[PDB]
Amino acid sequence: VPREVEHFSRYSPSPLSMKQLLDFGSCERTSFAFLRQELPVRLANILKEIDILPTQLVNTSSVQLVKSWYIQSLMDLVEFHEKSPDDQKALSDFVDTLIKVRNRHHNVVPTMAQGIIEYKDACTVDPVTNQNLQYFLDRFYMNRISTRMLMNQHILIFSDSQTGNPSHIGSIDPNCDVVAVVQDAFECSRMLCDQYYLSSPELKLTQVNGKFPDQPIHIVYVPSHLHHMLFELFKNAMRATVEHQENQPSLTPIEVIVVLGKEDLTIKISDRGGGVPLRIIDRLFSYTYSTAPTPNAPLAGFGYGLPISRLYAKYFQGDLNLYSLSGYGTDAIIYLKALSSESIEKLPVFNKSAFKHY
Amino acid sequence: VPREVEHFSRYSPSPLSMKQLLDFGSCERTSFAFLRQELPVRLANILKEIDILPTQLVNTSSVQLVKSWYIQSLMDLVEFHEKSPDDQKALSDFVDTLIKVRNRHHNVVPTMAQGIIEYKDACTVDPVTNQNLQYFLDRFYMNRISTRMLMNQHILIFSDSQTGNPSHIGSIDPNCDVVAVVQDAFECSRMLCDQYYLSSPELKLTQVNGKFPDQPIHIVYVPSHLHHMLFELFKNAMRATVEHQENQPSLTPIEVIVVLGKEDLTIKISDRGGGVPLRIIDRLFSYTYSTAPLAGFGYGLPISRLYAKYFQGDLNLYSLSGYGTDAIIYLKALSSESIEKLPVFNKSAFKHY
Ligand SMILES: Nc1ncnc2c1ncn2[C@@H]1O[C@H](COP(=O)(O)OP(=O)(O)NP(=O)(O)O)[C@@H](O)[C@H]1O
Ligand SMILES: Nc1ncnc2c1ncn2[C@@H]1O[C@H](COP(=O)(O)OP(=O)(O)NP(=O)(O)O)[C@@H](O)[C@H]1O
Ligand SMILES: [Mg+2]
Ligand SMILES: [Mg+2]
């Protein structure tokens, strides 16, 4: 283990709120000062943790690759430790380095998932029931969600060439039109559903602005994250509805209700897709668990939709739960904090405690 | 900590299935041998657990009362270990003793509740202890639900003049009409709601038998337990609906859907009572959490969840703050899988504390 990894793994990650992230777009040297220290801390924490996985898994070429990438990115960032935040050239080179790191990590999720599979056929193992593997993957993916979020925020606000969405500050939409994201995600799921079944359920949507009656619903949020969650939940609800009702003349719609309360934004997605036994609910949330075979774009198969969507919801202190009525249908519920100041990063830390779980 | 208490606490409770409890009426001497042993075991296990509580809680007059009652009952029951299961007189007296024990324990819930309230009101409590009390109360009340169940099953089936409804086997209905219980529980709540609010929401009920299409929904269950869960959840939904819609002419109905699947019987109760912030959701199940001034001390949710969990079911709540709440009950659809979930005072429990 490189001394840099050992050293920086000693610190605990420092979570930011969405408000703080927005404010970076309200100087560059402040974001530079924070990130050149924080990214190595987050990378070092997860690198130490990778060094605990089963010999058989850590040795998969896929995991070894991811490990090599994170180490290099860590080194690239630490090289900025000497520079002054007032050094304009250093700031520019830092943006270039974040772009390089972002590009290097672009295929991390797919490589790690492939490692899980290079693990299954190269060893005897059930990833679904492997509790340590599940614990690790949640932490590994949350760590990635957080580093990607932080680097993209800096790149999209301060770079010259990458501006992202004009209406966003970084990747954050201060006035996220939730219902619009819902409608977009639904249509994306629908197009996919049609290719697999030549039919798809329609959307029945209701919205209630409890905080401001009859007003459009907006909150500060990361639309790409919201879109991901909804897309995955819609794909699930559509697949279940169509298959459960394939022997019937028509399809019941998917009912969605969007509610804005004083401190929470809640989205409920209900289907009449037959549901699942309460006994199986937790399994649904395990990485790789799927009733479809492991896989242009697959409607189902990866076994990632639920756990990853839940990570996005919990990343800023929200949550995602499934409550099913076996024999009838399922209600999927997303909770998001309605205040940017309470939307604080939920980050895994490598410490005595975490180690105890392993 | 009398000898019998330490002795019987050394055995671990033996959980029975709904399927086994049905056979109580198919003999009396076997049920007698089982209970004269099992009841003392369950009482002793919880009695030892009580001695682990904070000294100021244990010394409340309420906890001391509960402890003295459980000890007397344990002794009354242990006395029967010297009698023969073939002693016809011993069998009759055993039933009389079960009735005596049931009477003695009648006030257990409120009494334990009072002790907790006094302890929390007068003493500073750290997060660890607070968590331990919730854990204790869940175990203490589940323990009482289990002993009450076993004793009633024996009395109702083998008593000379306290046998109860002939259509049930003890307190169990082999063909429980779930929808009927739902409707009755709704009405009991509505009657109370009207009395206090002068108005009450209506019921909109839907039913789906996925296990046997178009057919009525029945499962083997203890109707009084099911009624308790529904009644409490209905009172909560009605109070929330009425108070949230006070500035409204009418009241939205309470929507209920009953579903029978292969492994589960599921009941979802939906209201438009404004819901609760995500931050408070977990807190709702704490015994000391209540927004009541139709409502009370905060027992509805946690006790209802215990009844659901007692035979391996569950009770969950999800809310849409600013709109309403969905309360859902899950019960096993197979009697063979409906097995008592019992707390045991072993080293594993001791450490949890
Ligand atoms: N609304 C639903 N109704 C019934 N079953 C569901 C529902 N949602 C999820 N499931 C079950 O949970 C399993 C895993 O869901 P998920 O985690 O999203 O991965 P997947 O949909 O199977 N593969 P993918 O989404 O491509 O990563 C599904 O394959 C279903 O068996
Ligand atoms: N459907 C609901 N809608 C809104 N709030 C609810 C709902 N159900 C429960 N609550 C809240 O949770 C608290 C506790 O509920 P509960 O555990 O049933 O005890 P209680 O109703 O307060 N007293 P009790 O008479 O013992 O049931 C309530 O006082 C409410 O603040
Ligand atoms: Mg999916
Ligand atoms: Mg109540």
Contacts of A271 in chain B (CB under 8 A): none
Bridge-based pairing state of the strands B314-320 and B324-332: antiparallel
Question: Resolution for this model in angstroms, one decimal place?
Answer: 1.9
What residues does CATH 1.20.140.20 cover in chain A?
1-167
Q: Chain centroid to CA B41: how far?
A: 19
What residues does CATH 3.30.565.10 cover in chain A?
168-346
CA–centroid distance, B172 to ligand 1, in Å, is 37
Q: Chain centroid to CA B38: how far?
A: 19
B235 Cα nearest atom in ligand 2 = 21
Is B300 annotated as belonging to a binding site?
yes
Question: E strands of chain B, at which residues?
Answer: 173-177, 203-209, 218-221, 254-260, 264-271, 314-320, 324-332
Identity of the residue in B257, B314, B321 whose CB atom sits nearest the CB atom of A278: B314
Query: Which residue, A148, A149, A137, is CA-closest to A348?
Result: A137
**DSSP run (H or E) holding B273:** none
- Give the span between the Cα atoms of A183 and A187, in whole angstroms: 6
- Give the span between the Cα atoms of B192 and A101, in whole angstroms: 65
What residues does CATH 3.30.565.10 cover in chain B?
168-341
Amino acid residing at A159: S
Backbone phi, psi, residue A61, to 5°? -55, -35
CATH class of residue range A168-346: alpha beta
> How many angstroms separate the CA of residue B43 from the nearest CA in chain A?
31
Cβ of A273 below 6 Å from ligand 1: yes
**DSSP run (H or E) holding A268:** strand A264-271
- Give the span between the Cα atoms of B194 and A79, in whole angstroms: 73
- Give the span between the Cα atoms of B344 and B352, in whole angstroms: 12
Residue minimizing CA distance to atom 9 of ligand 1: A236
Residue pair B136/B130 in contact (Cβ under 8 Å)? The answer is no
Check B322 against A260: CB less than 8 A apart.
Answer: yes
Contacts of B261 in chain A (CB under 8 A): 275, 277, 325-328
- Give the span between the Cα atoms of B111 and B136, in whole angstroms: 15
- In the PDB record, what is the listed experimental method? X-ray
Per-residue tokens: A343: 């939307």
User: What is the count of residue pairs from A and B with beta carbons less than 8 Å apart?
Assistant: 101
CB B214: neighbour CB atoms within 10 A?
6
CA–centroid distance, B237 to ligand 2, in Å, is 8
Per-residue tokens: B239: 């109070």
- Give the span between the Cα atoms of B351 and B330, in whole angstroms: 30
Closest ligand to residue B295's CA: 2
Residue pair A211/A217 in contact (Cβ under 8 Å)? The answer is no
Would you name the residues of B annotated as active-site residues?
Answer: 228, 232, 235-236
Is B301 annotated as belonging to a binding site?
yes
Would you name the residues of A annotated as active-site residues?
Answer: 228, 232, 235-236
Pocket of ligand 2 (CB under 6 A): B 232, 236-237, 240, 271, 273, 275-276, 284, 289-292, 295-301, 325
The CATH code belonging to domain B1-167 is 1.20.140.20
Identity of the residue in B259, B322, B326 whose CB atom sits nearest the CB atom of A208: B322
What residue has token string 């299409």? B213
- Give the span between the Cα atoms of A344 and A315, in whole angstroms: 8
Backbone phi, psi, residue A271, to 5°? -130, 165
Per-residue tokens: B274: 């404004």
The CATH code belonging to domain B168-341 is 3.30.565.10
Cβ of A233 below 6 Å from ligand 1: no
- Give the span between the Cα atoms of B190 and B201, in whole angstroms: 7
